[PDB]
Enzyme design. Structure first.
Site, PDB file in Angstrom:
ATOM      1  N   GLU A  76       0.532  -3.578   2.122  1.00  0.00           N
ATOM      2  CA  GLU A  76      -0.872  -3.291   1.874  1.00  0.00           C
ATOM      3  C   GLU A  76      -1.389  -4.161   0.735  1.00  0.00           C
ATOM      4  O   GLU A  76      -0.663  -4.474  -0.212  1.00  0.00           O
ATOM      5  CB  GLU A  76      -1.062  -1.806   1.549  1.00  0.00           C
ATOM      6  CG  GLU A  76      -2.497  -1.396   1.225  1.00  0.00           C
ATOM      7  CD  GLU A  76      -3.352  -1.170   2.463  1.00  0.00           C
ATOM      8  OE1 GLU A  76      -3.355  -2.038   3.363  1.00  0.00           O
ATOM      9  OE2 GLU A  76      -4.027  -0.121   2.535  1.00  0.00           O
TER      10      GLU A  76
ATOM     11  N   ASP B  63       2.699   0.092   4.842  1.00  0.00           N
ATOM     12  CA  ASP B  63       2.294  -0.187   3.469  1.00  0.00           C
ATOM     13  C   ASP B  63       3.365  -0.911   2.664  1.00  0.00           C
ATOM     14  O   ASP B  63       3.043  -1.821   1.893  1.00  0.00           O
ATOM     15  CB  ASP B  63       1.915   1.115   2.758  1.00  0.00           C
ATOM     16  CG  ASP B  63       0.758   1.825   3.429  1.00  0.00           C
ATOM     17  OD1 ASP B  63      -0.181   1.137   3.878  1.00  0.00           O
ATOM     18  OD2 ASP B  63       0.789   3.071   3.515  1.00  0.00           O
TER      19      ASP B  63
ATOM     20  N   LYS C 199      -0.424  11.338  11.158  1.00  0.00           N
ATOM     21  CA  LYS C 199       0.218  10.047  10.932  1.00  0.00           C
ATOM     22  C   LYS C 199       1.480   9.901  11.774  1.00  0.00           C
ATOM     23  O   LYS C 199       1.743   8.826  12.324  1.00  0.00           O
ATOM     24  CB  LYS C 199       0.539   9.871   9.447  1.00  0.00           C
TER      25      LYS C 199
HETATM   26  C1  LIG Z   1      -1.505  -5.191 -15.621  1.00  0.00           C
HETATM   27  C2  LIG Z   1      -0.692  -4.601 -14.469  1.00  0.00           C
HETATM   28  C3  LIG Z   1      -0.705  -5.571 -13.286  1.00  0.00           C
HETATM   29  C4  LIG Z   1       0.259  -5.076 -12.207  1.00  0.00           C
HETATM   30  C5  LIG Z   1      -0.104  -5.709 -10.859  1.00  0.00           C
HETATM   31  C6  LIG Z   1       0.542  -4.936  -9.704  1.00  0.00           C
HETATM   32  C7  LIG Z   1      -0.142  -5.280  -8.377  1.00  0.00           C
HETATM   33  C8  LIG Z   1       0.447  -6.504  -7.643  1.00  0.00           C
HETATM   34  C9  LIG Z   1      -0.489  -7.701  -7.845  1.00  0.00           C
HETATM   35  C10 LIG Z   1      -0.802  -8.537  -6.588  1.00  0.00           C
HETATM   36  C11 LIG Z   1      -0.298  -9.962  -6.802  1.00  0.00           C
HETATM   37  C12 LIG Z   1      -1.385 -10.979  -6.457  1.00  0.00           C
HETATM   38  N1  LIG Z   1      -1.050 -11.767  -5.278  1.00  0.00           N
HETATM   39  C13 LIG Z   1      -2.025 -12.201  -4.276  1.00  0.00           C
HETATM   40  C14 LIG Z   1      -1.214 -12.564  -3.040  1.00  0.00           C
HETATM   41  C15 LIG Z   1       0.110 -13.044  -3.587  1.00  0.00           C
HETATM   42  C16 LIG Z   1       0.269 -12.274  -4.886  1.00  0.00           C
HETATM   43  O1  LIG Z   1       1.295 -12.124  -5.459  1.00  0.00           O
HETATM   44  N2  LIG Z   1      -0.280  -8.004  -5.327  1.00  0.00           N
HETATM   45  C17 LIG Z   1      -1.102  -7.324  -4.329  1.00  0.00           C
HETATM   46  C18 LIG Z   1      -0.334  -7.423  -3.018  1.00  0.00           C
HETATM   47  C19 LIG Z   1       1.123  -7.388  -3.444  1.00  0.00           C
HETATM   48  C20 LIG Z   1       1.096  -8.071  -4.813  1.00  0.00           C
HETATM   49  O2  LIG Z   1       2.036  -8.554  -5.352  1.00  0.00           O
HETATM   50  N3  LIG Z   1       1.789  -6.862  -8.083  1.00  0.00           N
HETATM   51  C21 LIG Z   1       2.133  -8.099  -8.773  1.00  0.00           C
HETATM   52  C22 LIG Z   1       3.544  -7.914  -9.339  1.00  0.00           C
HETATM   53  C23 LIG Z   1       4.178  -6.827  -8.476  1.00  0.00           C
HETATM   54  C24 LIG Z   1       2.996  -6.087  -7.876  1.00  0.00           C
HETATM   55  O3  LIG Z   1       3.051  -5.031  -7.347  1.00  0.00           O
HETATM   56  N4  LIG Z   1       0.465  -3.496  -9.932  1.00  0.00           N
HETATM   57  C25 LIG Z   1       1.621  -2.584 -10.006  1.00  0.00           C
HETATM   58  C26 LIG Z   1       1.107  -1.334 -10.717  1.00  0.00           C
HETATM   59  C27 LIG Z   1      -0.344  -1.249 -10.320  1.00  0.00           C
HETATM   60  C28 LIG Z   1      -0.756  -2.694 -10.114  1.00  0.00           C
HETATM   61  O4  LIG Z   1      -1.870  -3.102 -10.114  1.00  0.00           O
HETATM   62  N5  LIG Z   1       1.626  -5.404 -12.573  1.00  0.00           N
HETATM   63  C29 LIG Z   1       2.230  -6.766 -12.585  1.00  0.00           C
HETATM   64  C30 LIG Z   1       3.745  -6.525 -12.634  1.00  0.00           C
HETATM   65  C31 LIG Z   1       3.922  -5.192 -13.281  1.00  0.00           C
HETATM   66  C32 LIG Z   1       2.653  -4.445 -12.992  1.00  0.00           C
HETATM   67  O5  LIG Z   1       2.507  -3.273 -13.093  1.00  0.00           O
HETATM   68  N6  LIG Z   1      -1.268  -3.331 -14.075  1.00  0.00           N
HETATM   69  C33 LIG Z   1      -2.596  -3.141 -13.491  1.00  0.00           C
HETATM   70  C34 LIG Z   1      -2.917  -1.658 -13.665  1.00  0.00           C
HETATM   71  C35 LIG Z   1      -1.569  -0.968 -13.672  1.00  0.00           C
HETATM   72  C36 LIG Z   1      -0.615  -2.033 -14.196  1.00  0.00           C
HETATM   73  O6  LIG Z   1       0.468  -1.838 -14.630  1.00  0.00           O
HETATM   74  C1  LIG Z   2     -10.466   0.803   9.806  1.00  0.00           C
HETATM   75  O1  LIG Z   2      -9.909   1.547   8.763  1.00  0.00           O
HETATM   76  C2  LIG Z   2      -9.311   0.769   7.770  1.00  0.00           C
HETATM   77  C3  LIG Z   2      -8.169   0.045   8.058  1.00  0.00           C
HETATM   78  C4  LIG Z   2      -7.558  -0.720   7.070  1.00  0.00           C
HETATM   79  C5  LIG Z   2      -6.292  -1.521   7.382  1.00  0.00           C
HETATM   80  C6  LIG Z   2      -5.040  -0.667   7.588  1.00  0.00           C
HETATM   81  N1  LIG Z   2      -5.249   0.678   7.086  1.00  0.00           N
HETATM   82  C7  LIG Z   2      -4.159   1.366   6.423  1.00  0.00           C
HETATM   83  O2  LIG Z   2      -3.100   0.864   6.319  1.00  0.00           O
HETATM   84  C8  LIG Z   2      -4.383   2.753   5.847  1.00  0.00           C
HETATM   85  N2  LIG Z   2      -5.722   3.271   5.788  1.00  0.00           N
HETATM   86  C9  LIG Z   2      -5.952   4.615   5.219  1.00  0.00           C
HETATM   87  C10 LIG Z   2      -7.377   5.135   5.185  1.00  0.00           C
HETATM   88  C11 LIG Z   2      -8.041   5.179   3.974  1.00  0.00           C
HETATM   89  C12 LIG Z   2      -9.342   5.644   3.925  1.00  0.00           C
HETATM   90  C13 LIG Z   2      -9.970   6.058   5.087  1.00  0.00           C
HETATM   91  C14 LIG Z   2      -9.302   6.008   6.299  1.00  0.00           C
HETATM   92  C15 LIG Z   2      -7.999   5.542   6.360  1.00  0.00           C
HETATM   93  C16 LIG Z   2      -7.250   5.487   7.699  1.00  0.00           C
HETATM   94  F1  LIG Z   2      -6.259   6.425   7.701  1.00  0.00           F
HETATM   95  F2  LIG Z   2      -8.086   5.719   8.753  1.00  0.00           F
HETATM   96  F3  LIG Z   2      -6.684   4.255   7.850  1.00  0.00           F
HETATM   97  N3  LIG Z   2      -4.829   5.427   4.687  1.00  0.00           N
HETATM   98  C17 LIG Z   2      -3.483   4.892   4.735  1.00  0.00           C
HETATM   99  O3  LIG Z   2      -2.557   5.502   4.323  1.00  0.00           O
HETATM  100  C18 LIG Z   2      -3.251   3.548   5.310  1.00  0.00           C
HETATM  101  O4  LIG Z   2      -1.958   3.044   5.354  1.00  0.00           O
HETATM  102  C19 LIG Z   2      -8.118  -0.775   5.801  1.00  0.00           C
HETATM  103  C20 LIG Z   2      -9.267  -0.055   5.517  1.00  0.00           C
HETATM  104  C21 LIG Z   2      -9.862   0.716   6.502  1.00  0.00           C
HETATM  105  O5  LIG Z   2     -11.026   1.441   6.213  1.00  0.00           O
HETATM  106 MN   LIG Z   3      -0.881   4.182   4.049  1.00  0.00          MN
HETATM  107 MN   LIG Z   4      -1.712   0.471   4.791  1.00  0.00          MN
END
Ligand SMILES: C[C@H](C[C@@H](C[C@H](C[C@@H](C[C@@H](CCN1CCCC1=O)N1CCCC1=O)N1CCCC1=O)N1CCCC1=O)N1CCCC1=O)N1CCCC1=O
Ligand SMILES: COc1cc(CCNC(=O)c2nc(-c3ccccc3C(F)(F)F)[nH]c(=O)c2O)ccc1O
Ligand SMILES: [Mn+2]
Ligand SMILES: [Mn+2]
Length: 180
Positions: A65, A93, A119
């Site tokens: 996700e 997810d 689900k």
């Molecule tokens: C300050 C700190 C920042 C959080 C960030 C982390 C979310 C997530 C970040 C992105 C990476 C961006 N993209 C774009 C595509 C390629 C790519 O890499 N995405 C989203 C898709 C998957 C992913 O990797 N990342 C990055 C590292 C691991 C991770 O899960 N997290 C986790 C907690 C809530 C949150 O936001 N980090 C950084 C490392 C430790 C940490 O907690 N924050 C923000 C508020 C709470 C908090 O602690």
């Molecule tokens: C069209 O709908 C949506 C679909 C997506 C992409 C895939 N979606 C999910 O992966 C997902 N979405 C939900 C969610 C959250 C709020 C309202 C409704 C839902 C759902 F159950 F209907 F789907 N909850 C989950 O746990 C989950 O895994 C992204 C955004 C969308 O609005």
């Molecule tokens: Mn989900």
């Molecule tokens: Mn999802």
């Protein structure tokens, strides 16, 4: 469009989560400025999935996700073609490298029994693990295997109740509960 709900979402949630939720809704034809109850929900679901992957090892989890629809499917294709796990019909997810299974994270405003049933009925084959959270502190997982330890799950429950409190304090919880 205004909306008190949209202003709270931007003030309450992380800017990167709000940006990722905005991209997710527009990718599926929904605007965060009118569908504000939804807007708060994908933001909550996004944060919960991120806290979940943070629990456990620094590795262990592969986040599905938050990516684009094409990129997220490309990752599960690589995960399936590497571990031999069957291809899920619907986008999950996370993926557990420690337990070799995809995880479907759910955040509901009902009881954990219904949302799990909906689900699980939609989930093609019970191979993908299902973990449900609630705004009241409840949780339910497949085969009672809650994946993470109690500490990491307890904070997700605590964070969920803080969101519910901040929303009821702004008189927005009632409309949020009767929208799912
Ligand atoms: C300050 C700190 C920042 C959080 C960030 C982390 C979310 C997530 C970040 C992105 C990476 C961006 N993209 C774009 C595509 C390629 C790519 O890499 N995405 C989203 C898709 C998957 C992913 O990797 N990342 C990055 C590292 C691991 C991770 O899960 N997290 C986790 C907690 C809530 C949150 O936001 N980090 C950084 C490392 C430790 C940490 O907690 N924050 C923000 C508020 C709470 C908090 O602690
Ligand atoms: C069209 O709908 C949506 C679909 C997506 C992409 C895939 N979606 C999910 O992966 C997902 N979405 C939900 C969610 C959250 C709020 C309202 C409704 C839902 C759902 F159950 F209907 F789907 N909850 C989950 O746990 C989950 O895994 C992204 C955004 C969308 O609005
Ligand atoms: Mn989900
Ligand atoms: Mn999802």
């Amino acid at each position: 469009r205004g909306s008190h709900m949209e202003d709270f979402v931007r003030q309450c949630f992380n800017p990167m989560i709000v940006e990722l939720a905005e991209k997710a809704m527009k990718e599926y034809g929904e605007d965060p400025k009118i569908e504000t109850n939804k807007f708060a929900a994908i933001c909550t679901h996004l944060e919960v999935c991120f806290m979940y992957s943070d629990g456990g090892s620094k590795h262990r989890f592969e986040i599905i996700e938050g990516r684009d629809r094409i990129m997220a499917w490309t990752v599960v294709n690589s995960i399936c073609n590497t571990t031999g796990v069957e291809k899920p019909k619907f986008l999950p997810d996370l993926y557990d490298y420690k337990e070799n299974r995809f995880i479907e994270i759910g955040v509901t405003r009902r009881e954990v029994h219904i949302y799990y049933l909906e689900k699980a009925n939609k989930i093609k084959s019970e191979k993908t693990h299902i973990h449900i959270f609630s705004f009241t502190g409840e949780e339910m997982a497949t085969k009672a295997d809650y994946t993470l330890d109690e500490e990491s799950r307890a904070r997700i429950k605590t964070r969920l109740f803080t969101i519910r409190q901040e929303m009821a304090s702004r008189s927005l919880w009632d409309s949020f509960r009767q929208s799912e």
